[model samples]
Target: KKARMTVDKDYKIAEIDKRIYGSFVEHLGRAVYDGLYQPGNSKSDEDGFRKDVIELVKELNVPIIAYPGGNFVSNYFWEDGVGPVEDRPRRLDLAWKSIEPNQVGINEFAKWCKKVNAEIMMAVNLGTRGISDACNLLEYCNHPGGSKYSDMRIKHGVKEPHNIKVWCLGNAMDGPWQVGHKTMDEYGRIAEETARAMKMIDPSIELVACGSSSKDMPTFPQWEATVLDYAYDYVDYISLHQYYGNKENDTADFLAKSDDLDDFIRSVIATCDYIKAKKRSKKDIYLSFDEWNVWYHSNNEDANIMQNEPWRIAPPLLEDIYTFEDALLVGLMLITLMKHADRIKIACLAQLINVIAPIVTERNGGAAWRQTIFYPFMHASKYGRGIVLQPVINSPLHDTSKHEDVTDIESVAIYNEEKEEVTIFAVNRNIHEDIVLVSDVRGMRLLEHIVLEHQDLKIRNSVNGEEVYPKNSDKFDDGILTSMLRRASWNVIRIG
Candidate 1:
């Protein structure tokens, strides 16, 4: 098989946002307890954070992390997770059917993020709580001192404020399954008011209003239009959450889902533009794809645990053991996000640890290991910086179960001018054929080629072993690069 792509120094997508490689750590499951913060364990740091997990996260060079909650934040009290650890209250988490220990609160998470050299993208509760609560949390987090909330922060031993720059107005308020699901107008009004109040508290902060949870949501584009109609001027970006699955066991179709993601992003952009036209506003709203990943491996088991064992703190929920095939799709998703870096400024990998995450940990006190999906994210986060160059490709196409004319070779290029390097990320969606990628590397030389491929799609990584990893392979000459992309593989070709 043969494929051709052109990468010019001039043609570009957009300068990539370092935050686009961000990850999430919700209060759900072991994402908090044994995941990031585990006290008294041998593997833990002085602050009770898992040292091994920190090391893995740092390797990915994650710039920002969305914190505290996913659905858990909808009903969460910000005060519960701060101040004296002993004084923190234990409440029922209506979102995930778990008990919130309030062990790692705003202060602790802020400290952890600092330790890892990551900034916080904080979320405020708009579900059971309202604007005042959101304002109070912002004041507690961002205000330097002297006021009631600011003074409280100093009293709690945090002399300086966290000064979080980005704040999420809410999470997935459009979903019926959400803790405080609301109608379009209801969420839009609440979000607008919350954003207004929070901005008043700290205008320096960037706010993201919740859009649809998924493109499949009945509200979808209408949801975006309605919400943005109310909160357009107040918010910086609209949030998008999407997850793909291989429940149908169709590898071709699963990989093709990134196309759907691209379409979803485009539709949302259209909606935002329409609203922009209606309001006659010059300000353009960006996107925060704050939640995305390949989920479903542990769905059946997660439902069983949530239903059978209610109110268990960090009860092994959403622990998906990723397969090799899942990692390929994750690479495709990353490529898709990078391709649209102009509009989608911030995105989280749904999670960072133990809950459909790239990194996994042992319960209580055991080793933390990288899942099959970790390598792609790590590679992208490390080298997919600088400006994303637009790739003009002439590639063969294949048909999936649900998608026709799907390009077998899906790829994007990133030119890091500061570093004097160009990186091309590509995926071979053809499950049965290897393809030769010939690219015109104008005025550049191939530095290295890193390929991730495995014969078995179901192969996974465990504490005992790693099945998926990058292997250096390729040949190039005279500004022309040629490489073999194995059947259903992720390839990273570097040029400098």
Candidate 2:
């Protein structure tokens, strides 16, 4: 098969937001205690933060990290996690049903983000809480140190304020499973007022109101519509959360799920525009794809942890050891996110470590390493910057078990004007045949071809070592910047 595209220097979609490569670090499981903060481990630094983990996160160059909780934030109380570690309370985490030892609070997490050179996309609990609490957390984190909460932060030894910019009004508040879940009206009103007040405290901060957790939710576009109707004026972006998996083990169909993600993103964008028109406003509300990734690998194990063991700190939960096929899907997802660069301003890969993440660490200071899916995320975050050229392509389509018209080649070309470099991110999902991508990269010479491919679709990476990683390839030709994309391969073609 052959995929053809024209990449002109003038063709522009939008300048890609670096935060689209952002990742999540929820308080669930070892994501907090064991994965990142292994206090006494030989690999830890003076702050009890894992030095090894810090290096890996630094390598990815993630600009922003959504923190503190997923569902855990729904019922969370920021007050319990402040002050001295000795004075902090161990509260019952109702969402995850674990004992949340408030050891790593906002202050500690802000410091951790500093170590990794990332800003915090702090989330407030609109569920089981309201505008007052959200404002208090904002004041504590960003209000410079004169007001009550800011002074309280100064008293706690954080002489300087966190000054966190991006704030989430709530997480999955529409889901019945979340703590203090609310209807569209309830969540909308609360988010509006909360965002209003928080902005009053610090107008520099951007607010993200919760949308539906997944596209399949019964109240999808409507959920965003109703919520934005109340919140469009107050919030800057609406959140979109989605996770894909190969439960059916149909690799072709599983790879096609990125098409579903594309649809989900476009639908949300349309919803946002609809709200913009309704409000008679000149402003446009962007999207924050804050939670996304390939999940479902550790469902049974997570259930086992939930049912059998409870109140254990950093117990392994939602730890989905990624497979080679998972990497292909991740590559496809990254391409999809970049393709929608116009509206999707922020996209977090559901998690950062241990829990359905690209990086994995052995518990209690054993080892730290990248998962099979790490290469795609690393490559995208590293090279998928700059302005995304609008996709003008001709590619063959394949019919999977559950999806038709699935593109054999999913790709995006990014032109970094300042550096004078153009990177083409492409994925060939056809399991049986290779595809040659012929593109007119005007006045650009091939710099390097980086390919991530594995013959064993089921191979998983562990602390022992990576079974799937990127290797340099010289498959690019000068005449037209032609490159052969191998079957089921993630390709990064660089041009300068």
Candidate 3:
């Protein structure tokens, strides 16, 4: 197969948001327990946070991390996790059916994020709790001092307020599986009021209203429209969550799902614009793809663990051991997000540690290691900055079982003018044929080509050994950058 593309400095998508390289750390499963915080372990620091995990997260250069929830926050009480650790109360987390030890609370998480050099994108409990609780949490985190919640922070030993800027009104409220799931109207009203009250407390803070949990959700674009209809004026961005699965074992079809993601983003953008027109509003609502990743590796096992050992404290759940093919799909998804960076300002790689995350740790203070999918995210975070260039490409197409005319070469070019570098991230979806890419770099000089390819799609990375990683190889001449994109691979071509 053959493909050709042109990269022009003037043709741009949008200036990439550094937060688009953000990651999430939910309190569910081992993500918080043995994942980031393992007290008393030899590898742990004085605060019990895993030093090795901290080093790994710092390497990824994550700018922001959403805290204390996936579903876990729906029924969570902010008060329970605050104050002195000895006096903190333990509660039941209905979201993941786990026991909330309250050992690592907001203060602890804020400190940990500081250690990792990540800002906290806090999520308030709008599910079981409502507007006033959200306001109180905000006051405690962002308020300077004097008032009730703000003063409470002083008593709790955090002399300074957390000063978290971006806050989520709720998580997955449109889905029935959510702990305090609501209808479109219910969530819309709640989110609007919460956003309103939160901004009043700290006008500087930004808010994100929950959109549909997934593109396949029954509520979908309508949910986005209805929610934004009420909260658009007050909220800065709407949240998007999605996860890809490969149950059918179709590599071509799985990689092509990035097309579906593109459609999902466009549809939501259309709905946002439609509401803007309807309300005669001048302000635009951006998107935050805050939760996304490839999940399904431990679905069956997760069901067994959650069902059989209910109420266990951070049991081994949602630990998806990612494969080489999964990493390819992740790269494609990242490219898709960068292509739409004009509106999608912030995106998180569903999680950071343990549960379907890029970084994995062995149980009981064991060795922490990077998963197969970590490299693409790391590479993008490290190099995919500055203005995202709009790539004009003409490539061969293939038909997947579910998607037709899927482009054989999925690519996006990012120009870092500050560094004087142009990065072309490309994926070869063809499972059988290698694609020769003839890229017109427009006056740029080819720097290097990094290729991530594996003979077996099922090959995985482990603490013992890594089967999937990036290797550099390519050729450049004149103004054309020639590279061989291997069958079923993720390739990064850099030029200067």
Candidate 4:
């Protein structure tokens, strides 16, 4: 009744960057005001971040969090959100067709990150704006000397420069929907210039240039190749953005989409190498998977919400309350991320809270709940530390629209020598048949299986009621495991 797993010790890949489990937070929907920083709310902390949401995020062990934009960054003016709260201007978000009341800005967000014990991954507006603004922003955040922006930062009551190390060029530069989308040449030139200036300000910082918006972009491999050809010498890594969904509700095929992520990672690596060879560069470009998640259900309503509407402050958009099936796919995606950890130095769960994400909020209410997707993200972020071990599973397969005969059992293993723990994260995509798994320990000692299984695939957790979530199971043996992975389930087995 159980699928078998054979662990080979010799197939170890590279160690994963702990930052690979990073997450994103944009100023869209409730992710900002209502999700994390609702002033005067019942559940809010002294700084106004939601206590429950903070607790959930903490549990996920999110190390580095990208900030202040998805599309929101393309047209954003960073200065609007920085000064005094009452003096801050409320502006319409042209990106999401909503209003962004400058209630939370760099200062408040920096404070929030401090409370959460996470590092900041700041993004600048390179789309509608240009290099001057990027330079000024960098000076304001990282400069300790007496300049106008730096002095202003000091006057803001925080004398210490935030010194945020990671900077994203912009978000989704390739998407035409971006406010000031540019040709590859335009973006590359600007990005290179910006990177040079930012490093001039703080040479320690790492930069990520925007690649294609998604793998399916009309300008996929070509976009990366062209962008990297110009900016490789200036930037540290190239950025990738992708989101998956099952609009047709094909559960089996949808679950198999992890293969798509694998292919995407592989293809991007190839493109990076090809560019490296052409330019004869010694330094190879790594990957910053800056944006990724399951987002499709938010389309119709989000379109209707934005249609013919004038922008207001923080108008709701892409506030998708996730379903259980969505969570399964998210887990699968995390597995894929781990599998490709060699090249993926930074990976973010797009829009961490309330904006088409794994964590949901109650509009105009204090209560918040974890989406079904929350478990896998939390699990992987927690146990997916240390060196990644290559997984070779001989499982059955099923065909999907975007991919064919993708393996039904998808998994990745990690051994944390520091903690002396070995964790295996697996997802069974078979919608009807549970997989019975057996495997070797690869010479490591076996620990108990720490499983997270949902009761039903169609189940969803919403703000108004009881949520279907993953729970632990201790049925599997420590070594020579024999366990049934439900038709559609995610399992995490940790051992020493």
lDDT for 486 (candidate 1)? 88
What tens-digit string does per-residue lDDT give for candidate 1 at 1-496? 9989988878878999999999898999999888888898888889999898899999989899998768888999889888888998999998888898998898999999988889999998888899999999899989998899999999999999999999998787877788888999999999999998888999999999988878888888888899999999899999888999999999889899999989988998999999999999999999999999999988888889777999998999989999999999999999999999999999999898898898898877678999999999999998999898889999999998899999999999999999898888999989999898989877476679888899899999999978888877644789888888889899998888
Minimum summed lDDT over a 10-residue window in model 3 is located at: 467-476
TM-score of each: 0.98, 0.98, 0.98, 0.96
Candidate 3 ranges with C-alpha deviation above 4 Å = none
Candidate 2's C-alpha runs over 4 A off are 474-479
The ten-residue window of minimal lDDT in model 2 covers 473-482
* Alpha-carbon lDDT, every model: 0.90, 0.88, 0.90, 0.82
Off by over 4 Å in 4: 1-3, 400-402, 464-466, 474-479
User: Could you list the CA RMSD of all candidates, in the order they appear?
Assistant: 1.0, 1.1, 1.0, 1.8
For model 2, what is the alpha-carbon lDDT of residue 11?
Answer: 77
Candidate 2 residue pairs that clash: none
Candidate 1 differs from the real structure by a C-alpha RMSD in angstroms, to one decimal, of: 1.0
True-structure lDDT of candidate 3:
0.90
